[PDB]
Design a protein around this ligand. Structure first.
Ligand SMILES: C=CCOc1cc(C)c(F)c(C(=O)NNS(=O)(=O)c2ccccc2)c1
Ligand code: NA
Ligand SMILES: [Zn+2]
Length: 268
């Protein structure tokens, strides 16, 4: 018998997948999570007592981004082991393909929070290998279900590439992506490339965006904006074609932007 329901903050959320919480936790009808320190508890009564005792009102680590009430905390897995393990167990309830939960020392975790008077409430996160031999700028990326399809996933994608830009490198999410993750990356790639083409080789777009040439090419191919000539992909678009795509309905929701001026981060 697995965890199938959690209470976190003011949300109740049904599980999507098995997560390896200890057996005596899974047997409970519901798992209760502190939204600030991510301690998981078996009972409403232990949860209530914890909420009156727990002093955390935001993630640990350093706040590397803050604009208005949107915040990102960078949490090193070796410095905040228990917190990152609890985050990975929570994330695994909603990710099919995540496989690492307890060996969190090789990872850095970027926690997205939405702030009010009571504290900084967790929306989602992405993990990132401190040293990625494969050039992955995201390992896992997860938005909690009640915040999905509301701009927060796009924010975290954009954020991951802003880190890659500051590292003077290109990067790509680790595969396989969740179904919603695939749609989200394709939408983000399309809007970023189209806006750059409206305002350039494939290599130029890559240096400007930190999107890999492969991801640029596959995105341009889905837009039918690339020709093939003697073994080379070449951009083939008219400014008018770019503008038709850009004012289609899917590019109409006003994003939460990543303001590079509010990003406080030096590359390792
Ligand atoms: C639970 C497992 C994975 O959860 C995820 C993972 C990712 C990467 C997401 F992007 C989202 C999400 O919520 N996307 N919707 S979006 O932010 O409005 C958005 C609009 C336009 C372009 C991009 C994104 C959820
Ligand atoms: Na639910
Ligand atoms: Zn707590």
């Amino acid at each position: 018998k697995y965890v199938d329901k959690i209470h976190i903050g003011n949300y109740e959320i049904d599980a999507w997948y098995f997560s390896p919480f200890p057996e005596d936790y899974g047997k409970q009808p519901k798992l209760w999570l502190c939204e600030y320190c991510l301690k998981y508890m078996k009972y409403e009564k232990s949860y209530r007592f914890h909420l009156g005792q727990c002093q955390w009102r935001q993630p640990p680590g350093k706040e590397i981004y803050r604009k208005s009430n949107i915040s990102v905390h960078e949490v090193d897995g070796k410095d905040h082991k228990i917190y990152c393990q609890n985050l990975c167990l929570l994330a695994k309830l909603f990710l099919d393909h995540k496989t690492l939960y307890f060996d969190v020392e090789p990872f850095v975790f970027y926690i997205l929070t939405e702030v009010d008077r009571q504290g900084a409430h967790i929306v989602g996160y992405f993990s990132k290998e401190k040293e990625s031999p494969d050039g992955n700028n995201v390992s896992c990326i997860m938005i909690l279900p009640p915040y999905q399809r509301r701009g927060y996933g796009r924010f975290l994608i954009a954020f991951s590439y802003e880190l890659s830009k500051l590292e003077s490198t290109v990067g790509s999410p680790e595969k396989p992506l969740s179904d919603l993750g695939k749609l989200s990356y394709r939408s983000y790639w399309s809007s970023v490339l189209l806006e750059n083409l409206r305002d350039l080789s494939i290599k130029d777009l890559s240096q400007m965006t930190s999107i890999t040439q492969n991801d640029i090419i596959s995105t341009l191919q889905s837009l039918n904006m690339v020709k093939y000539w003697k073994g080379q992909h070449v951009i083939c678009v008219t400014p008018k074609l770019v503008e038709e795509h850009l004012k289609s309905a899917q590019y109409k929701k006003p994003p939460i932007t990543v303001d590079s001026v509010c990003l406080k981060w030096a590359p390792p």
